[PDB]
């Protein structure tokens, strides 16, 4: 039973690396992306100097 | 909600720089203009001192 009970809060509480490394893995593209667009975006309103006469 | 609020105060309160640009621009070159008539205009009682005075 103690091993079967163990298996039991492993499928439930357990860490699937696998699973959870491709997250880490996804989320620090999209942060890196964001980062990115933000930085395209901060630059954006420069464009009224511009046409500022 | 605080994005899209932040959307609509700006498609009301804020400045939209192109517009405005064109605008200072128009009302600069018609002050040029006027000022140009008005010297021209300054002058036009002297046709009086051709006729004697």
Same mark, same amino acid.
């Given at each position: ?13 357990? &860490?699937?690396?696998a699973?959870? &490394? &491709?997250?880490? &893995? ?28």
């Amino acid at each position: 039973i103690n091993e079967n009970v163990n298996a039991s809060k492993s499928r439930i509480k357990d &860490t699937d690396f696998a699973k959870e &490394t &491709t997250a880490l &893995t996804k989320s620090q593209i999209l942060s890196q992306a964001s980062s990115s667009v933000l930085a395209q975006a901060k630059q954006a309103p420069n464009a009224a100097l511009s046409l500022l006469g």
